Amino acid sequence: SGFRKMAFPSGKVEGCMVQVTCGTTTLNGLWLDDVVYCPRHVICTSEDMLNPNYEDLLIRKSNHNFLVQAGNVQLRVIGHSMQNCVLKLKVDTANPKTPKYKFVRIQPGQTFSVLACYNGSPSGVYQCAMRPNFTIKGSFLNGSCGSVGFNIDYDCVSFCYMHHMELPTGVHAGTDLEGNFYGPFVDRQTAQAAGTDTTITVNVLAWLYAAVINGDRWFLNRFTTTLNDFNLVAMKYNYEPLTQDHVDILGPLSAQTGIAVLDMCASLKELLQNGMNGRTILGSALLEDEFTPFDVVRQCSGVTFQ
Amino acid sequence: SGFRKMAFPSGKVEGCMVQVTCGTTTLNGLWLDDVVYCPRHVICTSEDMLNPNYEDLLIRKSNHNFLVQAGNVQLRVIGHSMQNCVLKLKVDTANPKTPKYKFVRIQPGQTFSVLACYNGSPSGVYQCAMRPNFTIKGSFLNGSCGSVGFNIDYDCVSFCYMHHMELPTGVHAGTDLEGNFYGPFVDRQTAQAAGTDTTITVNVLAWLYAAVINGDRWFLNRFTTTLNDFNLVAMKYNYEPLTQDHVDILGPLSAQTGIAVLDMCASLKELLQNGMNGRTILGSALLEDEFTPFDVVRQCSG
Ligand SMILES: *[C@H](O)[C@H](CC(C)C)NC(=O)[C@H](CC(C)C)NC(=O)[C@H](CC(C)C)NC(=O)OCc1ccccc1
Ligand SMILES: *[C@H](O)[C@H](CC(C)C)NC(=O)[C@H](CC(C)C)NC(=O)[C@H](CC(C)C)NC(=O)OCc1ccccc1
Ligand SMILES: [Cl-]
Structure with missing residues (x-):
């Protein structure tokens, strides 16, 4: 007996975590088959995080401007595209550790495990719920963007969250793996506030x-x-x-x-x-x-x- | 920011979990190099258990009385021995997923992650503290014995705990990976109780x-x-x-x-x-x- 706030085993996800560096900014990406998914704000600049034109910022980038590292192994980027607020970087090497997976968009009240990562390295795992106001009460520092939330079924990993930002009050906002934010938030540093947090x-x-x-x-x-x-x-x-x-x-x-x-x-x-x-x-x-x-x-x- | 009860990533340990069966008793083992570690009470019989004499119970046991399954693969036991309250099962295959690791003895107040397992497969991961009364407040069902607690430092998995029993009030007791209990408990179904809990x-x-x-x-x-x-x-x-x-x-x-x-x-x-x-x-x-x-x-x- 006993009852704990229990996360899923994270081994299958750890094998998909990589580091993506663009210029000065480093964050985490998710390596599945020959594609790395990561938050698009990795292309932002110090003085352009208030109204970034992501379309214009990405088209001016080249494949080599994205440095992708899987542990000590470099992955050559050979294609780059934008999907909503996430970047799809195509690499020539298919991830041998790719698990059976699907992308899912969860409902408020549903729970998932977060694998907190920094510089592509998994740091810890913990259980989270999607709040009714489409935020989560997580634990994320600078560099944690690109960390993912997931559930496991049988042998299939359902990815439901990628971390993008923190709102005042220490609450966290992110997207599904299609790149669409949960809730009405946008990936720019303009004033935003979460709505009413009700009990589930x-x-x-x-x-x-x-x-x-x-x-x-x-x-x-x-x-x-x-x-x-x-x-x-x-x-x-x-x-x-x-x-x-x-x-x-x-x-x-x-x-x-x-x-x-x-x-x-x-x-x-x-x-x-x-x-x-x-x-x-x-x-x-x-x-x-x-x-x-x-x-x-x-x-x-x-x-x-x- | 934010502050959550955070466990270590469990992937390095998942690759070490195996199933061990003796008679009708099944629990988990820890497969490191060519050795599998598990609680010695895997060899008890249902109608013994109140007061097993483990030396006596090993008199009968042969290598092939220990069925070890790593996932679907079957491991062949080529030797067994008892050390304190754990068994060491020598198998003919070294675990290719063995991490850099060490066995450590933790003290009350220190924390560690537990990977709860059943039939050698992971169920979940959570963070625990060794209470002052040498118990932990975990989440363990029958068949969970052999589940381990650990920390990860740099690239080294430091194993500190293996689960053996539950005392009433849903409190949990076990050993280090050398087989020595935390606290005054013994791996026997005789009446035992932890000291009153105190706050760290x-x-x-x-x-x-x-x-x-x-x-x-x-x-x-x-x-x-x-x-x-x-x-x-x-x-x-x-x-x-x-x-x-x-x-x-x-x-x-x-x-x-x-x-x-x-x-x-x-x-x-x-x-x-x-x-x-x-x-x-x-x-x-x-x-x-x-x-x-x-x-x-x-x-x-x-
Ligand atoms: C990515 O690793 C990082 C993780 C956070 C935990 C810091 N996120 C960001 O850096 C992110 C980048 C932007 C371009 C999407 N910005 C924020 O999350 C930002 C952090 C604060 C502390 C500056 N918050 C933010 O912009 O929220 C909107 C906002 C702005 C102004 C006033 C209130 C709310
Ligand atoms: C191993 O998979 C299992 C996990 C538990 C969470 C059930 N443990 C045992 O089966 C273990 C085996 C014995 C030989 C060490 N026994 C216990 O943990 C036992 C469980 C209860 C349900 C009987 N606990 C126990 O015997 O505690 C001592 C005790 C006995 C009698 C009265 C009070 C206290
Ligand atoms: Cl409380």
Whole structure:
């Protein structure tokens, strides 16, 4: 037993991380087959990060202006193109370590693992959620751009995030691997602010089921609630509305534990209206909303990735 | 910026994980060079286990009683031996993915990453601290034994932990990679309990420095304290004593932030006695103690 904020094993992704240098700027890229994907702002200049004309800046570049390094091995760039906010650099060498992969655009409330990298070198891994305002609360320093977020299925790596910027408040914004930002953000240093960060109600209920599975039961009560009445309380604490689709995906956890979804909702309502009274749930004093129902089942059943 | 509980990349270790089966018991092994390491209780029988005599149980065992699977490939065991609480299975194939590595013994308060595995395959990775009572708060199910904890330094994988058991309250115990338990525990299903848990004071202070570096400073105050007076408060809240060596170890974080160590101790004292008054620190309502001072420097600066 036990329940931790658990990342995917990162080995498959580590083998795809490379370093891309353009002029003075160095960041990370993702090497899949004969293409390296990286944030296009690697071509920016010191005094042109406010209104960069990326089209004009790239066409004036040549293939040799992009220095791509896979560990100590140089990769010759033999083609370069722009796709939205990411750069597709074609290399003559196909990555022997390319995993079975796909590019996916995740929904708010969904979780993924971030492999933080610097100078093409993986530095650490941690679990993140796409917030309802399309930012993530990560850990990124200068040089971390190009680090990716991902999920794993069976043997297939689903890449969903590439890191581009940090907004004031220490929150992070990025794109999918098609180069399109999550949320309304743009890759220039003009004033931008994230929207309302609400709590992911379906994830909190999943984590409450994880608690029960692992022995924490003090918050269970003999009350029930209607979905209508729960949402009226939820809205007042800036929680996402719980929908029928959310009730459905909580089904399996409800069945494994014998606690009906609306009974767990009654417990969550009580916690919201009265707090924890100095007690803790899975070692937390706050209600955790960065585990999905599938994350809970994944960890509590011990599914592995070959 | 930002501050997260961060694990090491697990790829160097994934390449070392194998499956070991004896009878009907299956767990994980660590394949390094031509040797596979695993907990010795792989050789227990369901109806023994309360009080196994491992010497006696090895009387029967032959090499071929140990089935080792590296992914799909089957490894042939050509020799076995017991060292402390681990088995050393000699196989005829050296692991071509063996990293540069060493075995290290960590001390309470130090942190490490765990790659949780089942049937020799990875499930997930997370960061743990060796508690003062020589347990860790992990996430381990049946079949997870043999999963290892590690750090990565430069290009060297420093293995420090191998999982063996769970005590009630969901706390976890294991050995170093030489086979010697952390703490007073034995690999036997007789009643055992960890000492009462205490908080790793030097780590909380390091995390408070991380908070300042990342912009959270509402808890800084105008008071100071002495090392003695702070430890009077620590003791009453079940915090570990803070020593002059701890103060020294926190020096570099104190110099980076401009906040003397005993001034941060005064902040911590006020948090212990008054709470957070509805506020959070680095997104937490509780004082976090699973980041060492080195962990903070690493994450906040390369
Ligand atoms: C890439 O490695 C790096 C990672 C960050 C964690 C720093 N990102 C950038 O350098 C990025 C480059 C631009 C051209 C996309 N810029 C930012 O992320 C930037 C950082 C601040 C601290 C200057 N933030 C930013 O431009 O946000 C928009 C903004 C501007 C002005 C006021 C408020 C918000
Ligand atoms: C290995 O895969 C597995 C991982 C655990 C997370 C289940 N560990 C064991 O099977 C281990 C084997 C013994 C011989 C060392 N046993 C335990 O860890 C056992 C688990 C419980 C569920 C029985 N713990 C144990 O025996 O703790 C001591 C104890 C015994 C009786 C009463 C209180 C405490
Ligand atoms: Cl908390």
